[PDB]
């Protein structure tokens, strides 16, 4: 069991460095979001406040 | 050196121009500093009966003069302070004026 319980701690490390709050946090970061960078904003109605 | 004394304390000159939501929490931090002055200790204990006496008129109606009793006592082993600590408890009196400091005798 202590052989098996230490293998839970060995396999947990990679998710802790990425600050995953579980073994079930698989929220994926989009590399480049479309609304941030694709636009040209001139006189008129604009894309935000 | 166990010595129990009486004291008056002028809280009006210590709470001059203090924000109304921070008067009664500040008057508590004065007595821990005020018992540090006379007895020369850091760990100062306030009785729950004294906490009622400060806070009785809300946060913003702390009394002008209080009449305290500061008792210095021996402290227990494996405490990291030093073997002495104070203990501040209130004595209930008619008027806080007209009183000066008095050594309470021991028995």
């Amino acid at each position: 069991r202590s052989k098996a319980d230490r293998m839970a701690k060995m396999e947990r490390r990679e998710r802790n460095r990425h600050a995953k709050q579980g073994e079930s946090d698989r929220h994926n970061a989009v590399s480049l979001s479309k609304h941030l960078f694709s636009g040209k904003r001139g006189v008129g109605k604009t894309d935000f406040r | 050196d166990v010595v129990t004394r009486e004291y008056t304390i002028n809280l009006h000159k210590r709470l001059h121009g203090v924000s109304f939501k921070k008067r009664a929490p500040r008057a508590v931090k004065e007595i821990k500093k005020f018992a540090k002055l006379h007895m020369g200790t850091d760990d100062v204990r306030l009785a729950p009966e004294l906490n009622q006496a400060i806070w009785k008129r809300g946060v913003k109606g702390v009394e002008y003069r209080l009449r305290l009793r500061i008792s210095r006592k021996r402290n227990e082993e494996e405490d990291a302070k030093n073997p002495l600590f104070s203990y501040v408890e209130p004595v209930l009196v008619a008027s806080a004026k007209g009183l000066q400091t008095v050594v309470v005798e021991e028995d």
Binding site: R17, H18, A19, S33, L36 | -
Partner: protein
């Protein structure tokens, strides 16, 4: 094993490490260079006084826009600060290295910190939220600590060529001078 480059005797030297310690790195660089090279018994009481706002840690490198205080006149720097959470780990390692020296059987009074070294660990990756739905990082900088204590040691013929003309000059003056 595999510390930094050390020039000392490994016979009379204990050591201690700390891996993946979740402190700030910029605070633990400075509270390691304040202590580097002191006597061991003087270093521990100093760190006991840093907690009580009696003596401050000087910040030399990571020190932009730090407020001033008067307690850095001892070291000659206006900028100083009292990083408390960094001291509570670093003096925890001095208690270890003092305990490691008693197992080897070294003196307590002669011992001094000779090497202390702190460098960056793998960073946390935590995220926070900003205006316009933008996602920027919000991360830590943990650090590895290692230190080595050492006893103090109470201590601190080249053949020369010359020409035949210069060989005569010494021989002539030795003949003349009484």
């Amino acid at each position: 094993a595999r510390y930094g480059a050390t020039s000392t005797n490994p016979a009379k030297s204990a050591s201690a490490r700390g891996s993946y310690l979740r402190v700030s790195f910029k605070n633990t660089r400075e509270t390691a260079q304040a202590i580097n090279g002191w006597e061991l018994t003087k270093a521990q009481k100093y760190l006991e006084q840093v907690l009580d706002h009696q003596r401050a840690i000087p910040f030399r490198r990571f020190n932009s826009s730090i407020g001033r205080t008067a307690q850095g006149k001892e070291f000659g720097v206006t900028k100083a600060r009292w990083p408390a959470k960094s001291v509570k780990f670093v003096q925890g390692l001095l208690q270890n290295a003092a305990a490691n020296a008693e197992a080897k059987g070294l003196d307590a009074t002669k011992l001094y910190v000779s090497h202390i070294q702190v460098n960056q660990a793998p960073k946390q990756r935590r995220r926070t939220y900003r205006a316009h739905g933008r996602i920027n990082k919000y991360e830590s900088s943990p650090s590895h600590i290692e230190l080595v204590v050492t006893e103090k040691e109470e201590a601190v013929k080249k053949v020369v060529r010359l020409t035949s003309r210069q060989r005569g000059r010494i021989a002539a003056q030795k003949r003349i001078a009484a």
